[PDB]
Every structure is written in structure tokens, then in C-alpha cells.
Design a protein around this ligand. Structure first.
Ligand SMILES: [Cl-]
Ligand SMILES: [Cl-]
Length: 162
């Protein structure tokens, strides 16, 4: 298992524009197009992202290209973030994937805000962390995914994904 396989499981793959769990226009493997309410606006973002007139549909290869770019941006994002980098550097390989996943989903800014959690991550207080992370809108809105991530943090294995 690796970061790509892990996010592919969490996000799924869709070739037509769709609304995420928060109602925003998305496509491919969890690629957010826009927060805006307008489909046309979303179709314009999509064309711009892909570089052609898509008509709201892309190919698997295009979805994977967006995914590659997205994962790379998440990692680089983490590494450039003052609050995130030190956390990431302190972790083992599986947990680094968990952090990447979270950042992919909620953005650098969202994760960087789990202040108390970040501290526990660094102190490697796994059990405390799992409890603290569950007290969040994030966990209440997408509990199954959050449980998978939390177990990952708690155990340091890919068991939740197997
Ligand atoms: Cl893009
Ligand atoms: Cl869920």
C-alpha cells in the first residue's frame, strides 16, 4: 500500500463532474474544481485544468494526471509549511501518508489548524491523538474515512485499508 492507493480508496474515481460530500464540484480522484455554486463555473475550471474543451467529462488518464499533480502539491505544501514540516519530519512512513491524505482532503490550512493534535503527533501520543481528532467536524462529516485515518495514526499500520 502507498499514498496513491490509499487516497484512491478514499476518494474514488469519477469521470464526470460531481458534487462532493460538502456539495462542491469535483472530478477525477477527489480533484476539487470550485466552491462556487455554478456548474458553468466548474466546467470552465475543468477546461482550464485539462487544457481542452471537456464538456465536463475527462478520461482516466486525465484524472490520473490531476491526481499526480495533487499529491505532489500536498507533499510540497506540507514541506513548505512552518507548522507542518516539523511534524512530517518527525513521523514514520505510514503516518507521513496519513498526514498527506489529510492535507489532500482539507488543505494545508485546515490541517495546520489542528494545533493540539499536531502537538500530540509530535509527542507521539497515539491514543490521545485518536481521541482528540475524533472531536472534529471532519470526523462528524465523514466518519468512515476519518476512522480509517485515525486507526492509521493510532497503529502506524495500513490495517484499516486492508
Ligand atoms: Cl489544476
Ligand atoms: Cl465517510
Amino acid at each position: 500500500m502507498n499514498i496513491f492507493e490509499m487516497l484512491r480508496i478514499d476518494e474514488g474515481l469519477r469521470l464526470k463532474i460531481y458534487k462532493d460530500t460538502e456539495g462542491y464540484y469535483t472530478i477525477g480522484i477527489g480533484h476539487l474544481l470550485t466552491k462556487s455554486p455554478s456548474l458553468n463555473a466548474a466546467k470552465s475550471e475543468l477546461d482550464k485544468a485539462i487544457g481542452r474543451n471537456t464538456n465536463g467529462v475527462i478520461t482516466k488518464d486525465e484524472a490520473e494526471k490531476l491526481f499526480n499533480q495533487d499529491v505532489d502539491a500536498a507533499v510540497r505544501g506540507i514541506l513548505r509549511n512552518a507548522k507542518l514540516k516539523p511534524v512530517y519530519d518527525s513521523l514514520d512512513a505510514v503516518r507521513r501518508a496519513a498526514l498527506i491524505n489529510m492535507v489532500f482532503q482539507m488543505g494545508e490550512t485546515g490541517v495546520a489548524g489542528f494545533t493540539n493534535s499536531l502537538r500530540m503527533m509530535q509527542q507521539k501520543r497515539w491514543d490521545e491523538l485518536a481521541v482528540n481528532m475524533a472531536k472534529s467536524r471532519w470526523y462528524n462529516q465523514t466518519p468512515n474515512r476519518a476512522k480509517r485515518i485515525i486507526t492509521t495514526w493510532r497503529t502506524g499500520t495500513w490495517d484499516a485499508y486492508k
